Amino acid sequence: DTYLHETLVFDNKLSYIDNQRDTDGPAILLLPGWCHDHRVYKYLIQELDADFRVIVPNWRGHGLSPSEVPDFGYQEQVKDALEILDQLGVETFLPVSHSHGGWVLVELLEQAGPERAPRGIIMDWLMWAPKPDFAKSLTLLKDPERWREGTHGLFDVWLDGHDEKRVRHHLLEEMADYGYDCWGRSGRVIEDAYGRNGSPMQMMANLTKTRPIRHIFSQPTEPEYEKINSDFAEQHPWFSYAKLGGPTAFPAIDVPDRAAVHIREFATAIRQ
Ligand SMILES: CC(=O)Nc1ccccc1C(=O)O
Ligand SMILES: [K+]
Ligand SMILES: [K+]
Ligand SMILES: [K+]
């Protein structure tokens, strides 16, 4: 796409979207999850393109040409993300994560500090620790034998019974070139992130400087998930949530207009 660039980040060539929009801060930093790239954000980029600078970093061995790379985790994702922003001369940015991109976003808030990264939006990120099926998925992903079966179970959960053409295209075509090197790693990093931090919510409550964060999600759809968000929201003045009511675990693809309005509201609030 017309905004895709490549640059050496430390000892690694990384692709990134940068629309290089000459405009008032903050920059909007869209953070992919594991084993997909900027392609997940092509519709959200269209929504924001005119009014904001939009950067989408790809992770090591992520992008149009996936590749085996040495082991890394979310701490390196943060460093990779900041180096691209430093190279681009970006100061203030509003990070927005998809799913387990959320580990990068929260660590980026701690490392960048509340001046550089005053707020955050986490999209469709499992707020509780894995329930048995998701734990079984991560186990399958780490298995050199059963990793594809791992991704197949996840694709079933993410689509949640929906013939969602754009999301199916993302999973079965735009992720098709990712292999066991990425998927095994994702499974190790997510497993370890939960083990170490306990949960997304524990990690966010544990920031030195708490800041406005909104969780915008469509999945899971059960009332009991809406409750752990409502209970966390009552406990933490800085945490809010919106249920977007989209079909899939990919609101950036299937309700981009809705993702955009929340990102805009947080951007507008930083500009004041
Ligand atoms: C593309 C994507 O959502 N990444 C994942 C890969 C493995 C396990 C979980 C996820 C996730 O972030 O939901
Ligand atoms: K449909
Ligand atoms: K609140
Ligand atoms: K959705």
Query: Is residue 190 in contact with ligand 1, taking CB distance under 6 Å?
Result: yes
Q: For the chain, what are the domain ranges?
A: 4-130+199-271
Query: Is residue 35 in contact with ligand 1, taking CB distance under 6 Å?
Result: yes
d(CA 122, CA 145): 32
Among 148, 170, 195, 136, residue whose Cα is nearest residue 248: 170
Length of the chain, please?
272
Query: Is residue 142 in contact with ligand 1, taking CB distance under 6 Å?
Result: no
DSSP letter string, the chain: -TTEEEEEETTEEEEEEE-----SSPEEEEE--TT--GGGGHHHHHHHTTTS-EEEEPPTT-SSS--------HHHHHHHHHHHHHHHT--SEEEEEEGGGHHHHHHHHHHHHHHHS--EEEES---SPPPHHHHHHHHHHH-TTTHHHHHHHHHHHHHTT---HHHHHIIIIITTT--HHHHHHHHHHHHHHHHHHSSHHHHHHT-SS---EEEEE----SHHHHHHHHHHHHH-TTEEEEE---SSS-HHHHSHHHHHHHHHHHHHHHH-
Query: Is residue 97 in contact with ligand 1, taking CB distance under 6 Å?
Result: no
What is the number of the ligand 1 atom nearest to the C-alpha of 137?
8
Query: Is residue 185 in contact with ligand 1, taking CB distance under 6 Å?
Result: no
Resolution of this entry in Å?
Answer: 2.0
Q: Are 38 and 4 in contact (CB under 8 A)?
A: yes
232 backbone φψ class: left, alpha, beta (φ>0; ψ -120 to 50): alpha
Angle among Cα 88, 31, 174 to the nearest 5 degrees reads 110
Contacts of 37 (CB under 8 A, 6+ apart): 15, 56, 58, 62, 63, 64, 174
The string over 198-226, giving b where at least 16 C-beta atoms fall within 10 Å of a residue's C-beta and e elsewhere, is ebbbebbeebeeeebbbbbbbbbeeeebe
Q: Please give the radius of gyration of the chain, using alpha carbons only, rounded to the nearest integer.
A: 17
Angle among Cα 244, 97, 158 to the nearest 5 degrees reads 55
Contacts of 204 (CB under 8 A, 6+ apart): 106, 210, 213, 236, 239
Rounded to the nearest angstrom, the distance between the alpha carbon of 25 and the centre of ligand 2 is 37
Write out the residues surrounding ion ligand 4, Cβ under 5 A: 218, 246, 248, 251, 254
Q: Are 14 and 80 in contact (CB under 8 A)?
A: yes
Query: Which pairs count as long-range contacts for 86-92, CB under 8 Å and 24+ apart, including other chains?
Result: 87/7, 87/9, 88/18, 88/55, 90/27, 90/53, 90/55, 91/25, 91/116, 92/25, 92/26, 92/27, 92/116, 92/117, 92/118, 92/270
Q: Are 41 and 30 in contact (CB under 8 A)?
A: yes
38 backbone φψ class: left, alpha, beta (φ>0; ψ -120 to 50): alpha
70 phi and psi angles, rounded to 5 deg: -65, 150
Amino acid found at 46: Q
Q: 236 burial class (0-12, 13-18, 19+ CB within 10 angstroms)?
A: middle
165 phi and psi angles, rounded to 5 deg: -50, -50
d(CA 100, CA 32): 8
Q: Are 61 and 12 in contact (CB under 8 A)?
A: no
Partners of residue 83 on adjacent β-strands: none
Q: Are 189 and 55 in contact (CB under 8 A)?
A: no
Q: 238 burial class (0-12, 13-18, 19+ CB within 10 angstroms)?
A: middle
Among 152, 180, 143, residue whose Cα is nearest residue 67: 180
Q: How many CB atoms lie within 10 A of CB 145?
A: 9
Kindly report the CATH number that applies to the domain delimited by 4-130+199-271. 3.40.50.1820
By most ligand atoms within 8 Å of CB, the mutation choice from 34, 103, 159, 175 for ligand 1 is 34
Query: Is residue 193 in contact with ligand 1, taking CB distance under 6 Å?
Result: no
Residue 220: asked if its preceding bond is cis (omega within 30°), the reply is yes
Rounded to the nearest angstrom, the distance between the alpha carbon of 166 and the centre of ligand 2 is 9
Give the largest Cα separation in the chain, rounded: 53
Partners of residue 241 on adjacent β-strands: 215
Q: Are 53 and 20 in contact (CB under 8 A)?
A: yes
61 phi and psi angles, rounded to 5 deg: 70, 15
Among 17, 20, 19, 11, residue whose Cα is nearest residue 31: 17
